[PDB]
Amino acid sequence: EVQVLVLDGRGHLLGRLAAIVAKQVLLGRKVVVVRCEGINISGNFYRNKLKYLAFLRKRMNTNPSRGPYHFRAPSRIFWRTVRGMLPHKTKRGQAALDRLKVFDGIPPPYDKKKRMVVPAALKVVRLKPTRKFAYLGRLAHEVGWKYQAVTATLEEKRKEKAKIHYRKKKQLMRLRKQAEKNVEKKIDKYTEVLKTHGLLV
Amino acid sequence: VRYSLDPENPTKSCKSRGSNLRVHFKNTRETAQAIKGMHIRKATKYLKDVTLQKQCVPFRRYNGGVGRCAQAKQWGWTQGRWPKKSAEFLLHMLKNAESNAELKGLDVDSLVIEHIQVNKAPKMRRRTYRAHGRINPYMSSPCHIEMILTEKE
Amino acid sequence: SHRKFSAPRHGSLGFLPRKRSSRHRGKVKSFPKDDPSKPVHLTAFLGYKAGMTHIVREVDRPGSKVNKKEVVEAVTIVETPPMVVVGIVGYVETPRGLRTFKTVFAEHISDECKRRFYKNWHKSKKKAFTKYCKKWQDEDGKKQLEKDFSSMKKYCQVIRVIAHTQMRLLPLRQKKAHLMEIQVNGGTVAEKLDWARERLEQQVPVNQVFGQDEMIDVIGVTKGKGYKGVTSRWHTKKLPRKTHRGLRKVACIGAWHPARVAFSVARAGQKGYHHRTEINKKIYKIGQGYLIKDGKLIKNNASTDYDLSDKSINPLGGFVHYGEVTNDFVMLKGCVVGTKKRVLTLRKSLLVQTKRRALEKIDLKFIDTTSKFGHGRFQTMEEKKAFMGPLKKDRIAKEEGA
RNA sequence: ACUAAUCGAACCAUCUAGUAGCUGGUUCCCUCCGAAGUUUCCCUCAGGAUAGCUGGCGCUCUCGCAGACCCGAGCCACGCA
RNA sequence: CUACGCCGCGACGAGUAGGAGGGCCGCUGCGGUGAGCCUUGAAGCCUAGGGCGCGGGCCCGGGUGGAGCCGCCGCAGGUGC
RNA sequence: CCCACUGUCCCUACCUACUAUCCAGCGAAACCACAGCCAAGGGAACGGGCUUGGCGGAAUCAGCGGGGAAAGAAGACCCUG
RNA sequence: CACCCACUAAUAGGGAACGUGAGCUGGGUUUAGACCGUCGUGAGACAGGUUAGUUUUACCCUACUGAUGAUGUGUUGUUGC
RNA sequence: GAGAGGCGGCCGCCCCCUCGCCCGUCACGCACCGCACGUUCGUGGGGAACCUGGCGCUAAACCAUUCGUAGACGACCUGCU
Ligand SMILES: [Mg+2]
Ligand SMILES: [Mg+2]
Ligand SMILES: [Mg+2]
Ligand SMILES: [Mg+2]
Ligand SMILES: [Mg+2]
Ligand SMILES: [Mg+2]
Ligand SMILES: [Mg+2]
Ligand SMILES: [Mg+2]
Ligand SMILES: [Mg+2]
Ligand SMILES: [Mg+2]
Ligand SMILES: [Mg+2]
Ligand SMILES: [Mg+2]
Ligand SMILES: [Mg+2]
Ligand SMILES: [Mg+2]
Ligand SMILES: [Mg+2]
Ligand SMILES: [Mg+2]
Ligand SMILES: [Mg+2]
Ligand SMILES: [Mg+2]
Ligand SMILES: [Mg+2]
Ligand SMILES: [Mg+2]
Ligand SMILES: [Mg+2]
Ligand SMILES: [Mg+2]
């Protein structure tokens, strides 16, 4: 689609969401993934930490400054996963990669916007409830990410502000329902039309 | 004689030429590229400075092993040198072209080097002697130079 | 095949970019962790390596062979004229790191401080901060400054002060002052902002930042040695005399595979002029500097409780390659990176000093002031005159003096 | 060892374009067909002859050549695999 | 309906070494032939020019050049990198 | 083997001359399919190119000796003729 | 490889073209001189001993070491993450 | 509103129309004679230049010189009514 797709990273499985995002950006679509520290990875935490440590061991023995660049932020980890699912060595793949934006937490551009969810990548439906999983934020913190605490604090501030905004919206919706109950003699004429044609149960 | 890039108006323009001049082709090419587009007074004083090692010519294409200097930062370059012989040869050619402009009766305070070209001349053979009874060439690399000056102000 | 005998590696891989330091001053790179419980204080200072000398003191280390015994210990003199505070920076913590939030500069920035902003002060019009300093006078600029201070108070987590050294009080050629951000620690952001705003345009002496017999970190750039080979750079073994193409080399720079030269192989290049941080440098003395109350005072520099000699820290004939020290100085213990008159950063220790090496009281008995420009053998001018008596030039001056 | 920078047989010219079962190379297009590294013999085993596999040239025959548009009016070619 | 021509129908199309066919593919010279071309510009060479052929290659435009050259039927090679 | 002697060494440092270095002038040769960043895979069983990944930022200077199974010679060892 | 002396917390085992010769060295093996023993009639031979016996080139690309710089923010500087 | 605030909301004054939202009455507009790229963001981004008014500014960098906390050369630290 022509607008920017904003996806909440919390509760999503890493590879599923990354595959969906890769296929989206390959179709000429702008995708923004926020709160990449909430991304889950299937399998217990120690196993995934071992996987990332084994990745850390892969470095160029001659000159490690040329070797694989092990990114420690959850956003950059998800970005590297998506890049792994993209043909990033061609112009088309690089152009698709430039359409993807990843963030830890939710920045000011996107904290005032509705966030989509991919059910096909959600942990609650793609994973059995008895299975174990790891948080990308905790894994990133314990492998070298430095900004877990400041991200948590800023997320708490954002959640407080969102709670205030939601209380205002609930008050507005209550007042709207009261208004609808106030005007029913001058509204039932159109209300019955909407009821007749499937809208407005 | 036939030049390359004949002037768009050969009445505001004067020409100069040299053939089989005993200067190195690479240094002369770099110096000519340095002075190309300059006003004639600016080019003359710049060549005098190059002789006096107060301004350098940037060595851009023939720069293998050319050392770095602080005066190359005047240009967008790192390498530069001070070819005295090329500077003197281009100074003589500039004086010849200015005399031609005087002969054509157009004032020499508005001339700009619009065209300058260095071409390889036929090489001249000398001989050097090597370790095990071997002979190696000791060629020279002269050059043909042409320039066209044009009135504009 | 393995190497036949084991041997430890030459050099450290923790300092691998063995390159000329990108800076000359030497930046802190880590300030002490801030806790609001402590009083508001500065964490760093800028000094200049005047030179070295040695002291005599009695050691108070029980159970040691030098317990209640005299020792001679080399000390480094770092001249520290008071820093002048000219600005305040606020930082905000982001998930991408600290970022600069807002910088406010004081009015009447000193002339030597303004020299830092110009490559060529000789040709400059001296225009820096001229329009900025006019906003400290009008009401509009003052209101904007108050809003900036409020933004720092409510949004910033750590604040730092821009302080500069006083070139005019040093015997060096350089008149360009050294700027530096010094972190303010120990309180709420509001308290440290109030403290810093009071300290604007003011001079902060070194005795307010550091105390007696505390161990601090010294940050600076070492002495440059130019382009050096592996024997001088990495201290590898010299090859035998029978070696054909040179013996000051490394014989094998790698195996056939991995078919490349590893980054861990000793190779020739730049040596020296590296940025280095050394911790645990005890402060044996904080000199008081020269005063004029009725006459010039120099005694507070090298006279101790056991010497009582009216002499200064300046050696006979002056500090070699530095000049004369007349300001506050800090007497560190041991050696310090850098040449003479090299700018050094003194930083509060990041650790907690609980060993008995630390927190040990230092009481000097003697400070050596013999001439370092040779084998000096007289502490003072007066002692040398009293020993050698009159000379020929004294006689020829005294005949003219009648 | 040395015998003109040449020596376990100098240099120069000629026989001489010496011989080589061994190495290297071997020059335009399209179309059609299209392999063998196996048999026997050879002082033969990095090669030949020989049979086999291939191509080209044919020749001797076989079914009829069908209705000028159209419309067959038990028995359906030599022989071969 | 250039009978060495034209037309119809059906099946098929890999290819090294190798064999054969066709070449209105190409080079040089000779016998014939084109009442052929040419100082109102030959050969040669250059070309972001127009095309033809599966291809080997070929024709035409523009420039340069300044005295020779080509098509068809046969003939003969020191004939294609 | 011993005495003496010493930078052979422990364990390296400094100094001097000429270079190397930069500049003005002058100015080669070797070598060169194309080129030149890696890991693994498979492959004529040790890739610069291919596959999969890691990744990749103009132009350069002084060094350097890991690679180019670097260059130098149609292997002198072994076998065949 | 081995063995012994001594110290030591310990004196573990190995790979990287049996890592590493345009890094060295040349003691060994493995040219041409020579001696001995055995073998052979002899020329001569001997994983038998012994002695003397030229160790060539980097200035190329990459790798690595350091040194200038380059992309973008209008220019330019300071302080910084 | 500071996490990348590049945004959002509320007041006082002045000036408009009582139109704009729904159901109706009333007729008209190029009705371009079947046809595509129509319809927005958009007064789009970027670059030179002309005219038009107002409000404002009058600087640095590099070379040359100097240093020697530096240094192969560049680079770096410095100084210059
Ligand atoms: Mg080179
Ligand atoms: Mg010679
Ligand atoms: Mg000779
Ligand atoms: Mg071991
Ligand atoms: Mg030797
Ligand atoms: Mg001394
Ligand atoms: Mg063969
Ligand atoms: Mg075929
Ligand atoms: Mg021939
Ligand atoms: Mg030919
Ligand atoms: Mg590889
Ligand atoms: Mg051979
Ligand atoms: Mg041979
Ligand atoms: Mg080996
Ligand atoms: Mg080697
Ligand atoms: Mg060798
Ligand atoms: Mg030997
Ligand atoms: Mg021998
Ligand atoms: Mg016998
Ligand atoms: Mg014996
Ligand atoms: Mg000998
Ligand atoms: Mg060189």
PDB file of N, CA, C and O (backbone and C1' of nucleotides) in Angstrom, chain H residues 41-65:
ATOM      1  P     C H  41      -4.002  18.490  -4.759  1.00  0.00           P
ATOM      2  O5'   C H  41      -2.846  17.812  -3.902  1.00  0.00           O
ATOM      3  C5'   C H  41      -3.144  17.166  -2.673  1.00  0.00           C
ATOM      4  C4'   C H  41      -2.031  16.244  -2.243  1.00  0.00           C
ATOM      5  C3'   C H  41      -0.642  16.856  -2.188  1.00  0.00           C
ATOM      6  O3'   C H  41      -0.419  17.579  -0.991  1.00  0.00           O
ATOM      7  C1'   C H  41      -0.552  14.755  -3.280  1.00  0.00           C
ATOM      8  P     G H  42       0.309  19.010  -1.028  1.00  0.00           P
ATOM      9  O5'   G H  42      -0.104  19.625  -2.438  1.00  0.00           O
ATOM     10  C5'   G H  42       0.171  20.988  -2.745  1.00  0.00           C
ATOM     11  C4'   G H  42       0.327  21.221  -4.228  1.00  0.00           C
ATOM     12  C3'   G H  42      -0.834  20.748  -5.101  1.00  0.00           C
ATOM     13  O3'   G H  42      -0.980  21.639  -6.205  1.00  0.00           O
ATOM     14  C1'   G H  42       1.147  19.670  -5.782  1.00  0.00           C
ATOM     15  P     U H  43      -1.795  23.013  -6.045  1.00  0.00           P
ATOM     16  O5'   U H  43      -0.671  24.139  -6.116  1.00  0.00           O
ATOM     17  C5'   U H  43       0.261  24.176  -7.194  1.00  0.00           C
ATOM     18  C4'   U H  43       1.582  24.783  -6.784  1.00  0.00           C
ATOM     19  C3'   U H  43       2.335  24.037  -5.683  1.00  0.00           C
ATOM     20  O3'   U H  43       3.741  24.147  -5.901  1.00  0.00           O
ATOM     21  C1'   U H  43       1.884  26.244  -4.975  1.00  0.00           C
ATOM     22  P     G H  44       4.541  23.008  -6.708  1.00  0.00           P
ATOM     23  O5'   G H  44       4.336  21.685  -5.844  1.00  0.00           O
ATOM     24  C5'   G H  44       4.719  21.630  -4.479  1.00  0.00           C
ATOM     25  C4'   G H  44       5.479  20.367  -4.161  1.00  0.00           C
ATOM     26  C3'   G H  44       6.989  20.451  -4.302  1.00  0.00           C
ATOM     27  O3'   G H  44       7.610  21.048  -3.179  1.00  0.00           O
ATOM     28  C1'   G H  44       6.219  18.506  -5.383  1.00  0.00           C
ATOM     29  P     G H  45       8.857  22.042  -3.375  1.00  0.00           P
ATOM     30  O5'   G H  45      10.110  21.064  -3.454  1.00  0.00           O
ATOM     31  C5'   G H  45      10.277  20.022  -2.505  1.00  0.00           C
ATOM     32  C4'   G H  45      11.312  19.029  -2.962  1.00  0.00           C
ATOM     33  C3'   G H  45      12.603  19.624  -3.491  1.00  0.00           C
ATOM     34  O3'   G H  45      13.496  20.017  -2.464  1.00  0.00           O
ATOM     35  C1'   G H  45      11.843  17.973  -4.986  1.00  0.00           C
ATOM     36  P     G H  46      14.189  21.466  -2.518  1.00  0.00           P
ATOM     37  O5'   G H  46      15.409  21.260  -3.518  1.00  0.00           O
ATOM     38  C5'   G H  46      16.290  20.160  -3.369  1.00  0.00           C
ATOM     39  C4'   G H  46      17.020  19.866  -4.652  1.00  0.00           C
ATOM     40  C3'   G H  46      17.671  21.056  -5.332  1.00  0.00           C
ATOM     41  O3'   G H  46      18.905  21.430  -4.748  1.00  0.00           O
ATOM     42  C1'   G H  46      16.494  19.793  -6.933  1.00  0.00           C
ATOM     43  P     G H  47      19.318  22.979  -4.688  1.00  0.00           P
ATOM     44  O5'   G H  47      19.716  23.324  -6.190  1.00  0.00           O
ATOM     45  C5'   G H  47      20.788  22.651  -6.831  1.00  0.00           C
ATOM     46  C4'   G H  47      21.029  23.200  -8.214  1.00  0.00           C
ATOM     47  C3'   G H  47      20.996  24.712  -8.336  1.00  0.00           C
ATOM     48  O3'   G H  47      22.215  25.314  -7.941  1.00  0.00           O
ATOM     49  C1'   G H  47      19.716  23.749 -10.073  1.00  0.00           C
ATOM     50  P     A H  48      22.404  26.905  -8.024  1.00  0.00           P
ATOM     51  O5'   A H  48      22.949  27.146  -9.500  1.00  0.00           O
ATOM     52  C5'   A H  48      23.375  28.433  -9.911  1.00  0.00           C
ATOM     53  C4'   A H  48      22.927  28.741 -11.315  1.00  0.00           C
ATOM     54  C3'   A H  48      22.321  30.118 -11.517  1.00  0.00           C
ATOM     55  O3'   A H  48      23.304  31.125 -11.658  1.00  0.00           O
ATOM     56  C1'   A H  48      20.957  28.493 -12.558  1.00  0.00           C
ATOM     57  P     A H  49      23.192  32.481 -10.809  1.00  0.00           P
ATOM     58  O5'   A H  49      22.209  33.380 -11.679  1.00  0.00           O
ATOM     59  C5'   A H  49      22.433  33.544 -13.070  1.00  0.00           C
ATOM     60  C4'   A H  49      21.166  33.900 -13.802  1.00  0.00           C
ATOM     61  C3'   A H  49      20.349  35.034 -13.210  1.00  0.00           C
ATOM     62  O3'   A H  49      20.864  36.308 -13.545  1.00  0.00           O
ATOM     63  C1'   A H  49      18.920  33.239 -13.787  1.00  0.00           C
ATOM     64  P     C H  50      20.524  37.584 -12.631  1.00  0.00           P
ATOM     65  O5'   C H  50      19.102  38.063 -13.164  1.00  0.00           O
ATOM     66  C5'   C H  50      18.908  38.362 -14.539  1.00  0.00           C
ATOM     67  C4'   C H  50      17.500  38.825 -14.809  1.00  0.00           C
ATOM     68  C3'   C H  50      16.907  39.779 -13.789  1.00  0.00           C
ATOM     69  O3'   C H  50      17.362  41.110 -13.931  1.00  0.00           O
ATOM     70  C1'   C H  50      15.318  38.120 -14.326  1.00  0.00           C
ATOM     71  P     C H  51      17.480  42.046 -12.632  1.00  0.00           P
ATOM     72  O5'   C H  51      15.971  42.447 -12.307  1.00  0.00           O
ATOM     73  C5'   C H  51      15.196  43.172 -13.248  1.00  0.00           C
ATOM     74  C4'   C H  51      13.717  43.067 -12.970  1.00  0.00           C
ATOM     75  C3'   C H  51      13.238  43.591 -11.627  1.00  0.00           C
ATOM     76  O3'   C H  51      13.120  45.004 -11.592  1.00  0.00           O
ATOM     77  C1'   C H  51      12.222  41.505 -12.068  1.00  0.00           C
ATOM     78  P     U H  52      13.376  45.802 -10.220  1.00  0.00           P
ATOM     79  O5'   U H  52      12.160  45.375  -9.285  1.00  0.00           O
ATOM     80  C5'   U H  52      10.820  45.704  -9.623  1.00  0.00           C
ATOM     81  C4'   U H  52       9.840  45.001  -8.717  1.00  0.00           C
ATOM     82  C3'   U H  52       9.977  45.309  -7.235  1.00  0.00           C
ATOM     83  O3'   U H  52       9.347  46.522  -6.870  1.00  0.00           O
ATOM     84  C1'   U H  52       9.800  42.973  -7.539  1.00  0.00           C
ATOM     85  P     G H  53      10.210  47.870  -6.727  1.00  0.00           P
ATOM     86  O5'   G H  53      10.040  48.271  -5.197  1.00  0.00           O
ATOM     87  C5'   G H  53      10.825  47.648  -4.193  1.00  0.00           C
ATOM     88  C4'   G H  53       9.987  47.255  -3.004  1.00  0.00           C
ATOM     89  C3'   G H  53      10.729  47.148  -1.682  1.00  0.00           C
ATOM     90  O3'   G H  53      10.929  48.403  -1.056  1.00  0.00           O
ATOM     91  C1'   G H  53       9.405  45.227  -1.979  1.00  0.00           C
ATOM     92  P     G H  54      12.294  48.695  -0.261  1.00  0.00           P
ATOM     93  O5'   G H  54      12.029  48.081   1.183  1.00  0.00           O
ATOM     94  C5'   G H  54      10.843  48.394   1.896  1.00  0.00           C
ATOM     95  C4'   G H  54      10.565  47.370   2.964  1.00  0.00           C
ATOM     96  C3'   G H  54      11.709  47.092   3.923  1.00  0.00           C
ATOM     97  O3'   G H  54      11.796  48.057   4.957  1.00  0.00           O
ATOM     98  C1'   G H  54      10.794  45.048   3.170  1.00  0.00           C
ATOM     99  P     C H  55      13.224  48.466   5.568  1.00  0.00           P
ATOM    100  O5'   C H  55      13.586  47.251   6.528  1.00  0.00           O
ATOM    101  C5'   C H  55      12.701  46.861   7.567  1.00  0.00           C
ATOM    102  C4'   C H  55      13.060  45.505   8.113  1.00  0.00           C
ATOM    103  C3'   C H  55      14.502  45.338   8.554  1.00  0.00           C
ATOM    104  O3'   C H  55      14.745  45.878   9.841  1.00  0.00           O
ATOM    105  C1'   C H  55      13.863  43.483   7.238  1.00  0.00           C
ATOM    106  P     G H  56      16.177  46.517  10.182  1.00  0.00           P
ATOM    107  O5'   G H  56      17.096  45.245  10.433  1.00  0.00           O
ATOM    108  C5'   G H  56      18.480  45.275  10.135  1.00  0.00           C
ATOM    109  C4'   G H  56      19.036  43.881  10.017  1.00  0.00           C
ATOM    110  C3'   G H  56      20.515  43.783   9.689  1.00  0.00           C
ATOM    111  O3'   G H  56      21.330  43.938  10.837  1.00  0.00           O
ATOM    112  C1'   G H  56      19.290  42.299   8.312  1.00  0.00           C
ATOM    113  P     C H  57      22.834  44.480  10.694  1.00  0.00           P
ATOM    114  O5'   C H  57      23.625  43.250  10.069  1.00  0.00           O
ATOM    115  C5'   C H  57      23.849  42.063  10.814  1.00  0.00           C
ATOM    116  C4'   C H  57      24.888  41.214  10.138  1.00  0.00           C
ATOM    117  C3'   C H  57      26.117  41.974   9.670  1.00  0.00           C
ATOM    118  O3'   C H  57      27.082  42.103  10.697  1.00  0.00           O
ATOM    119  C1'   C H  57      25.288  40.637   7.902  1.00  0.00           C
ATOM    120  P     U H  58      27.951  43.444  10.829  1.00  0.00           P
ATOM    121  O5'   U H  58      29.241  43.132   9.953  1.00  0.00           O
ATOM    122  C5'   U H  58      29.845  41.844   9.995  1.00  0.00           C
ATOM    123  C4'   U H  58      30.600  41.534   8.727  1.00  0.00           C
ATOM    124  C3'   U H  58      31.740  42.494   8.398  1.00  0.00           C
ATOM    125  O3'   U H  58      32.814  41.767   7.811  1.00  0.00           O
ATOM    126  C1'   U H  58      30.185  42.467   6.616  1.00  0.00           C
ATOM    127  P     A H  59      34.177  41.560   8.633  1.00  0.00           P
ATOM    128  O5'   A H  59      34.270  39.984   8.839  1.00  0.00           O
ATOM    129  C5'   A H  59      33.432  39.323   9.771  1.00  0.00           C
ATOM    130  C4'   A H  59      33.491  37.827   9.602  1.00  0.00           C
ATOM    131  C3'   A H  59      34.862  37.191   9.745  1.00  0.00           C
ATOM    132  O3'   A H  59      35.224  36.988  11.102  1.00  0.00           O
ATOM    133  C1'   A H  59      33.757  36.304   7.846  1.00  0.00           C
ATOM    134  P     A H  60      36.668  36.396  11.488  1.00  0.00           P
ATOM    135  O5'   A H  60      36.539  34.833  11.223  1.00  0.00           O
ATOM    136  C5'   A H  60      37.626  34.096  10.693  1.00  0.00           C
ATOM    137  C4'   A H  60      37.163  32.931   9.855  1.00  0.00           C
ATOM    138  C3'   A H  60      38.262  32.027   9.329  1.00  0.00           C
ATOM    139  O3'   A H  60      38.635  31.053  10.286  1.00  0.00           O
ATOM    140  C1'   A H  60      36.775  32.581   7.571  1.00  0.00           C
ATOM    141  P     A H  61      40.158  30.579  10.421  1.00  0.00           P
ATOM    142  O5'   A H  61      40.335  29.548   9.225  1.00  0.00           O
ATOM    143  C5'   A H  61      39.497  28.408   9.132  1.00  0.00           C
ATOM    144  C4'   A H  61      39.620  27.745   7.788  1.00  0.00           C
ATOM    145  C3'   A H  61      41.036  27.532   7.285  1.00  0.00           C
ATOM    146  O3'   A H  61      41.661  26.396   7.856  1.00  0.00           O
ATOM    147  C1'   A H  61      39.729  28.453   5.559  1.00  0.00           C
ATOM    148  P     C H  62      43.239  26.408   8.142  1.00  0.00           P
ATOM    149  O5'   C H  62      43.890  26.233   6.703  1.00  0.00           O
ATOM    150  C5'   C H  62      43.615  25.083   5.920  1.00  0.00           C
ATOM    151  C4'   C H  62      44.066  25.275   4.497  1.00  0.00           C
ATOM    152  C3'   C H  62      45.510  25.703   4.312  1.00  0.00           C
ATOM    153  O3'   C H  62      46.437  24.640   4.434  1.00  0.00           O
ATOM    154  C1'   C H  62      44.132  27.052   2.969  1.00  0.00           C
ATOM    155  P     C H  63      47.919  24.928   4.979  1.00  0.00           P
ATOM    156  O5'   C H  63      48.632  25.695   3.780  1.00  0.00           O
ATOM    157  C5'   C H  63      48.799  25.067   2.520  1.00  0.00           C
ATOM    158  C4'   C H  63      49.282  26.036   1.471  1.00  0.00           C
ATOM    159  C3'   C H  63      50.628  26.690   1.730  1.00  0.00           C
ATOM    160  O3'   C H  63      51.717  25.847   1.405  1.00  0.00           O
ATOM    161  C1'   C H  63      49.081  28.323   0.999  1.00  0.00           C
ATOM    162  P     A H  64      53.073  25.900   2.262  1.00  0.00           P
ATOM    163  O5'   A H  64      53.547  27.416   2.153  1.00  0.00           O
ATOM    164  C5'   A H  64      54.212  27.897   0.993  1.00  0.00           C
ATOM    165  C4'   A H  64      54.604  29.344   1.146  1.00  0.00           C
ATOM    166  C3'   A H  64      55.406  29.686   2.392  1.00  0.00           C
ATOM    167  O3'   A H  64      56.784  29.387   2.270  1.00  0.00           O
ATOM    168  C1'   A H  64      53.646  31.228   2.163  1.00  0.00           C
ATOM    169  C1'   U H  65      56.243  32.395   7.113  1.00  0.00           C
ATOM    170  C3'   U H  65      58.343  31.325   7.024  1.00  0.00           C
ATOM    171  C4'   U H  65      58.011  31.899   5.658  1.00  0.00           C
ATOM    172  O3'   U H  65      59.726  31.371   7.323  1.00  0.00           O
ATOM    173  C5'   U H  65      58.238  30.983   4.481  1.00  0.00           C
ATOM    174  O5'   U H  65      57.564  29.745   4.642  1.00  0.00           O
ATOM    175  P     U H  65      57.559  28.661   3.475  1.00  0.00           P
TER     176        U H  65
END
